[PDB]
Amino acid sequence: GPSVFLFPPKPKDTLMISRTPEVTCVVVDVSHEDPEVKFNWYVDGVEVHNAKTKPREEQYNSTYRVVSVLTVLHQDWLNGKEYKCKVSNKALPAPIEKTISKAKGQPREPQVYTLPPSRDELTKNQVSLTCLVKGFYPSDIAVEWESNGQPENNYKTTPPVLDSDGSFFLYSKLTVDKSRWQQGNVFSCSVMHEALHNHYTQKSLSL
Amino acid sequence: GPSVFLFPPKPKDTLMISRTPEVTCVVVDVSHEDPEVKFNWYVDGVEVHNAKTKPREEQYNSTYRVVSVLTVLHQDWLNGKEYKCKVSNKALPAPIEKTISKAKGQPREPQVYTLPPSRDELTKNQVSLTCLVKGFYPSDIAVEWESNGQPENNYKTTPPVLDSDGSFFLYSKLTVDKSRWQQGNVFSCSVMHEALHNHYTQKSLSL
Ligand SMILES: *[C@@H]1O[C@H](CO[C@@H]2O[C@@H](C)[C@@H](O)[C@@H](O)[C@@H]2O)[C@@H](O[C@@H]2O[C@H](CO)[C@@H](O[C@@H]3O[C@H](CO[C@H]4O[C@H](CO)[C@@H](O)[C@H](O)[C@@H]4O[C@@H]4O[C@H](CO)[C@@H](O[C@@H]5O[C@H](CO)[C@H](O)[C@H](O)[C@H]5O)[C@H](O)[C@H]4NC(C)=O)[C@@H](O)[C@H](O[C@H]4O[C@H](CO)[C@@H](O)[C@H](O)[C@@H]4O)[C@@H]3O)[C@H](O)[C@H]2NC(C)=O)[C@H](O)[C@H]1NC(C)=O
Ligand SMILES: *[C@@H]1O[C@H](CO[C@@H]2O[C@@H](C)[C@@H](O)[C@@H](O)[C@@H]2O)[C@@H](O[C@@H]2O[C@H](CO)[C@@H](O[C@@H]3O[C@H](CO[C@H]4O[C@H](CO)[C@@H](O)[C@H](O)[C@@H]4O[C@@H]4O[C@H](CO)[C@@H](O[C@@H]5O[C@H](CO)[C@H](O)[C@H](O)[C@H]5O)[C@H](O)[C@H]4NC(C)=O)[C@@H](O)[C@H](O[C@H]4O[C@H](CO)[C@@H](O)[C@H](O)[C@@H]4O)[C@@H]3O)[C@H](O)[C@H]2NC(C)=O)[C@H](O)[C@H]1NC(C)=O
Ligand SMILES: [Zn+2]
Numbered sequence: 357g358p359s360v361f362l363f364p365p366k367p368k369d370t371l372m373i374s375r376t377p378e379v380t381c382v383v384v385d386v387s388h389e390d391p392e393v394k395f396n397w398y399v400d401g402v403e404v405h406n407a408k409t410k411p412r413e414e415q416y417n418s419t420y421r422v423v424s425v426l427t428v429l430h431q432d433w434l435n436g437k438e439y440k441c442k443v444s445n446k447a448l449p450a451p452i453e454k455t456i457s458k459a460k461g462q463p464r465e466p467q468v469y470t471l472p473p474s475r476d477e478l479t480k481n482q483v484s485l486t487c488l489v490k491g492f493y494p495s496d497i498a499v500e501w502e503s504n505g506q507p508e509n510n511y512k513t514t515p516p517v518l519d520s521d522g523s524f525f526l527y528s529k530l531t532v533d534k535s536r537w538q539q540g541n542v543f544s545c546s547v548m549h550e551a552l553h554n555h556y557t558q559k560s561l562s563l
Numbered sequence: 564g565p566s567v568f569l570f571p572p573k574p575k576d577t578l579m580i581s582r583t584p585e586v587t588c589v590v591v592d593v594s595h596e597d598p599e600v601k602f603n604w605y606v607d608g609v610e611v612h613n614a615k616t617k618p619r620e621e622q623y624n625s626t627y628r629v630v631s632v633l634t635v636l637h638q639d640w641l642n643g644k645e646y647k648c649k650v651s652n653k654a655l656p657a658p659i660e661k662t663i664s665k666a667k668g669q670p671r672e673p674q675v676y677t678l679p680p681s682r683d684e685l686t687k688n689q690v691s692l693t694c695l696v697k698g699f700y701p702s703d704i705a706v707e708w709e710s711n712g713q714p715e716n717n718y719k720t721t722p723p724v725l726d727s728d729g730s731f732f733l734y735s736k737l738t739v740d741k742s743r744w745q746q747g748n749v750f751s752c753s754v755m756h757e758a759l760h761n762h763y764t765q766k767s768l769s770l
């Protein structure tokens with residue numbers, strides 16, 4: 357019979373009040389002999405009716421796939437409200453329900469530290485600028501780099517790593533020409549996390 | 564019918580000539596009506612006969628599981644030899660073969676850089692000592708920390724991250740009391756990777 361998958365919003369969409377987070381309920385392996393699908397949505401057990409269901413789409417394996425999208429409020433998601441998607445179909449002996457929420461647990465604010473290149477690296481043509489983000493909970497987080505009101509995109513960030521105290525840390529590495537570093541430009545590590553003030557902070561790095 | 568899984572050696576066992584790396588061929592879902600299992604092992608297509616097969620073990624789901632262990636030579640594994648495990652059984656329409664080798668690709672030597680705590684962190688009771696390992700290929704690697712001929716084990720290391728040039732980097736974070744740092748102890752980041760001389764290097768960090 358059919359299977360249901362319930363997907364959370366994109367993490368950045370939950371941390372920027374200007375964006376619109378949504379949860380996505382996908383049903384797959386709907387058959388042609390029973391193609392009719394009913395979604396019901398609940399927020400903390402209270403049925404809501406503002407979801408937007410897309411029309412069925414036949415797949416190449418002779419099944420149907422159908423998606424319903426529920427917009428969630430910025431504050432509702434961060435305050436831990438629970439979103440339940442119930443999918444009903446004439447082939448199911450009982451409806452299928454799935455519930456999802458923001459990662460649970462007491463929040464912990466990141467500490468953000470920028471580290472200049474190692475003295476041994478200063479001999480190369482490019483240098484690594486390092487941003488350590490530690491002590492945060494939950495692990496949902498975004499990191500980017502900027503300089504002079506422009507995105508610096510030659511960077512990579514590690515996944516969050518579970519630290520010994522139950523919080524998370526990561527590192528972000530930005531690679532720049534040694535000349536840019538020596539000329540004194542200011543680089544900034546930008547971090548978005550639920551437990552920061554306005555879910556945002558910035559730390560800068562320069563010679 | 565039966566399924567076969569072929570496991571590589573532990574990465575540290577491949578990088579220390581004093582250790583003994585082995586590949587492990589596991590067969591699961593062997594039935595009771597056909598419990599007889601024959602392993603054949605090949606190194607670069609040449610059959611070898613020094614593997615050590617364990618006796619069948621019944622599982623709680625009324626199947627059998629059987630394991631064969633082939634020791635591999637330090638140099639053979641690092642030189643890219645291919646290990647094939649062939650499993651034969653009266654229930655298979657044809658034998659099952661699985662092949663495994665060290666991660667393939669031109670090797671690249673890690674650059675190892677140690678970074679002292681951020682100036683802003685020096686106000687806390689504990690500080691983070693950072694070891695950046697970058698530019699290495701393949702991603703198999705081990706990292707630990709030492710001080711005064713003793714293991715410093717209050718550390719966490721990120722997984723390898725694919726960098727923009729196709730090599731890998733990671734970071735290791737060692738947490739020590741601020742007093743230990745200020746008292747001038749020497750901490751050392753130890754790295755094992757195939758492309759280092761003797762697959763080993765060390766970098767030290769102190770105030
Ligand atoms: C018949 O065909 C259908 C349709 O598909 C085939 O699909 C592919 C393979 C084609 O090449 C063709 O062969 C076919 O058309 C099959 O349907 C599939 O069923 C699978 C299970 O049977 C199911 O697997 C589960 O996948 C989950 C992850 O799905 C992600 O990522 C995959 C890529 O890896 C992608 O295919 C999915 O679409 C889905 O993508 C995410 O979707 C969400 C929702 O839209 C996105 O979230 C939104 O994103 C937007 C921006 O994009 C915005 O931020 C919104 O706010 C936000 O809400 C998200 O961004 C997408 N991510 C990406 C990367 O794209 C797994 O989690 C899941 O796992 C759990 O799985 C197992 C349990 O079953 C266990 O291993 C374990 O417990 C795990 O916890 C499954 O792996 C497929 O998703 C599903 N495919 C689709 C397209 O729906 C059907 O199976 C087949 N039937 C038969 C009988 O063969
Ligand atoms: C009937 O029962 C059997 C037996 O087991 C049940 O097992 C558990 C669940 C119990 O609670 C009971 O319920 C039962 O007894 C079932 O057999 C299982 O079949 C699975 C597939 O059907 C198979 O899944 C595959 O697992 C691979 C990973 O296995 C690892 O890790 C798991 C833990 O996650 C562990 O259970 C395994 O033993 C194995 O552990 C590794 O073993 C190797 C070899 O020993 C170790 O390597 C050696 O290590 C030593 C030091 O330890 C030294 O360094 C040596 O030099 C070195 O060689 C390694 O260290 C071990 N690691 C760990 C962490 O322990 C997956 O990779 C694999 O995946 C691919 O899988 C899918 C494809 O099928 C895809 O998703 C994808 O393509 C992936 O690429 C599978 O997930 C189980 O391993 C297997 N269990 C065992 C114990 O063998 C059987 O299924 C069941 N039948 C039925 C019909 O229900
Ligand atoms: Zn309604």
Ligand SMILES: [Zn+2]
Nearest residue numbers: 438455456457
């Ligand atoms: Zn609940």
Ligand SMILES: [Zn+2]
Nearest residue numbers: 373430554555
């Ligand atoms: Zn907010």
Ligand SMILES: [Zn+2]
Nearest residue numbers: 603611612613
């Ligand atoms: Zn033999």
Ligand SMILES: [Zn+2]
Nearest residue numbers: 645662663664
């Ligand atoms: Zn081959």
Ligand SMILES: [Zn+2]
Nearest residue numbers: 580637761762
């Ligand atoms: Zn060697």
